[model samples]
Target: RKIDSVLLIDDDDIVNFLNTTIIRMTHRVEEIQSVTSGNAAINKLNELYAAGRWPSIICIDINMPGINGWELIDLFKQHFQPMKNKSIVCLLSSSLDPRDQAKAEASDWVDYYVSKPLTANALNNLYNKVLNE
Candidate 1:
């Protein structure tokens, strides 16, 4: 199965590189792009939206410098168009704490709460679930 595109939002270059690498192994994505900050992700999304499309998948880190995951979700809820809601928005949880899981599970905007660096199996499951649905 395949998806249109993916946007990875993380402040770490190593994390982004690792995710991109793992994602490429699946050979299921058309385009893979990443941003270092939440604001940058927003700007990039705006640019893409102006071009008449949004990434089919979006992964946002929970621990950002300025705009945290909650803030970004709030911003998304307030500013972004409804089409953004249709996209699969995943929240990256760097910690393995149960609190993080609870919060992530509670969010209406977050479609998936996956680990910091994505794994091959996770990507496969994600693809399978999204494509099958």
Candidate 2:
């Protein structure tokens, strides 16, 4: 099934705008929601869950000021564990840090690690991967 919704968690306004544009251009999902901070993202997730509107994918930036991507992943795993099986969590970042990539690759909660800005090709690949899995 095609993704019904997606959530983007990034602190940079420009990045969020550009990434939202890219994803919208792809026409891969019907809805796209975004939050500027990890805490906001978590709260939004809880709200979505309560509303029975869970996103099919969650793309998170790795270097937010408070509660970085790693911590966000842990929080999600702890508070929304069941959602992990229902949704794909991807680490999306512009950083070239090998350690960041390595950590994402090693994390059980992260389904994918993507370099920003989000592109049509990347979205297509991620969609297909989620579909197949």
Candidate 3:
């Protein structure tokens, strides 16, 4: 259950830079890879799987231009069975919508839904919780 790497799927450059820096500084993960859109994220995930490297966790944003977070989560769920033994999906967003939270809560595929500006404490909690589960 050790986290070997994290994949971040967000469209903002500044956000991605800051997020990557924070994850690198605080998390126990060995690497963090990022993509601009959900489509790119999916492709990257497939590519990683093809390369024999699957991320233990993936943080996806909800407000991207192409294939938004919900769509991404749905697709992930649809395709999850084949890769279910390998990884987990976590929704990473700046959304304040309660509906979004509710939707995330209803999903069996999503492990956690977190707000933007991820913190050290939050990351630690996520690591411990996911590993324990």
Candidate 4:
């Protein structure tokens, strides 16, 4: 699939800045939006959906102050349950917890389970894999 937009949900300002910069430098997506929490992310997504423009991919951090990544995934699945055919949800986190990885793997909503420190090549590989599939 051609990635037109990417929504990044992360609480850390530094991480968000770095991630967005890297994505922009790579020019993999036409647009990149960032929100600090899952609730805000959800709201932004709803706005996009209402405007008839949904992100091609979503990258969410597993840990946050409110409505963390896992819960966001669940809520997103509940809200956009039927339209999942057009979107890809990924867990982009620094956590290496086996349980977290297993949880992401178990969830059908999560398409990619990634950990940091994130590298350009790794993300590129994942993007290519997603497109190929």
lDDT of 4 by residue, 86-116 (tens): 7777787786778877887788777777875
For residues 13-90, what per-residue lDDT tens digits would candidate 1 score against the true structure?
899999999899888999999999989988998898788778888888888899887788888887885764567777
Model 2 C-alpha lDDT per residue in residues 102-125, reported as the tens digit of each score: 887787778778888887887887
Ranking by lDDT: 2, 1, 4, 3
Q: For all the candidates, what are their Cα RMSDs to the real structure?
A: 1.6, 1.4, 1.9, 1.9
Q: State the C-alpha lDDT per candidate.
A: 0.82, 0.84, 0.78, 0.79
Local error of candidate 4 at residue 64 (angstroms): 0.3
Model 4: weakest 10-residue lDDT segment is: 116-125
TM-score, candidate number 2: 0.92
Q: Can you give the lDDT of residue 17 in candidate 4? A: 87
* TM-score of candidate 4 versus the correct structure, residues matched by position: 0.88
Worst 10 residues of 3 by lDDT: 79-88
Q: Tell me the RMSD of model 2 versus the true structure.
A: 1.4
On lDDT, who's better, 2 or 4?
Answer: 2
- Model 4, position 131, has a per-residue lDDT of 84
Which of the numbered candidates is closest to the native, going by highest TM-score? 2
Best by lDDT: 2
For model 3, how does the per-residue alpha-carbon lDDT over 21-86 read when each residue is reduced to its tens digit? 888887487888889998888788888878878887777888899789999877887865677645
